[PDB]
Design a protein around this nucleic acid. Sequence first.
RNA 1: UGGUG
Length: 41
Amino acid sequence: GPLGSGQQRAGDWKCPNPTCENMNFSWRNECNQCKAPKPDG
RNA sequence: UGGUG
Ligand SMILES: [Zn+2]
């Protein structure tokens, strides 16, 4: 089916790295794959 | 921790 373990919640954020674009949970401050910061610095 | 569906 179209269902899966994936989810979406308010405050979530996508990796700013063009080489990553991974979706990250709201409580993370860095990317789950490329460790790129959520803020611009 | 809601982790790769
Ligand atoms: Zn990333």
